[PDB]
Enzyme design. Structure first.
Site, short mmCIF file in Angstrom:
data_model
loop_
_atom_site.label_atom_id
_atom_site.label_comp_id
_atom_site.label_asym_id
_atom_site.label_seq_id
_atom_site.Cartn_x
_atom_site.Cartn_y
_atom_site.Cartn_z
N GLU A 41 -1.07 8.33 7.07
CA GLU A 41 -1.60 7.37 6.01
C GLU A 41 -1.59 8.21 4.53
OE1 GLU A 41 -0.85 4.37 5.50
OE2 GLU A 41 -1.44 3.50 7.56
N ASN A 55 1.46 -1.20 -4.23
CA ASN A 55 2.12 -1.98 -3.62
C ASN A 55 3.08 -2.86 -4.76
OD1 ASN A 55 2.06 -0.64 -0.72
ND2 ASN A 55 -0.09 -1.46 -1.30
N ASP A 58 -3.55 0.57 -1.71
CA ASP A 58 -4.15 1.26 -0.63
C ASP A 58 -4.76 2.52 -1.13
OD1 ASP A 58 -2.57 -0.59 1.03
OD2 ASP A 58 -0.77 0.57 0.86
#
Ligand SMILES: [Cl-]
Ligand SMILES: [Cl-]
Length: 138
Positions: A35, A46, A53
């Site tokens: 990640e 995004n 995120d």
């Protein structure tokens, strides 16, 4: 902060992640690795859904933390899924991972468990993940 592999492993153990809701420490290690590369200040926007995120575990702003700018919530109140971790997204960008850890525990408390992260599925599921904790003394 960019954690060293075994330093993170020892930290997650201490924070009680080993076997949390049935998830081994190696799987948590595999997740952070893919990640963020063990980077607490990592962020990913995004463009697709206008969410971000945040942190070592790349926790998304649509459900888990509040960043004020992500579209999607109740107008008024009743059966309200928003900011499930009860944290500002900022909290997930600290060098101290206690808050990111508490949030990650909340994420896996939902039915999907660790499957909530697609990267876990592509990169860690059904793989030999022992490599991530080898020689860390955990
Ligand atoms: Cl906060
Ligand atoms: Cl907030």
């Amino acid at each position: 902060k960019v954690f060293e592999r075994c330093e993170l492993a020892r930290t997650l153990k201490r924070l009680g992640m080993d076997g949390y809701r049935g998830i081994s420490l190696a799987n948590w290690m595999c997740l952070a690795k893919w990640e963020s590369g063990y980077n607490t200040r990592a962020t990913n926007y995004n463009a697709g859904d206008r969410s971000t995120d945040y942190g070592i575990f790349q926790i998304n702003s649509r459900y888990w933390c509040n960043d004020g700018k992500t579209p999607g919530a109740v107008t008024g109140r009743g059966d309200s899924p928003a900011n499930a971790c009860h944290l500002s997204c900022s909290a997930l960008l600290q060098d101290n991972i206690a808050d990111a850890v508490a949030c990650a525990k909340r994420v896996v408390r939902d039915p999907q468990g660790i499957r909530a992260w697609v990267a876990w599925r592509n990169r860690c599921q059904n793989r030999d993940v022992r490599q991530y904790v080898q020689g860390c003394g955990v």
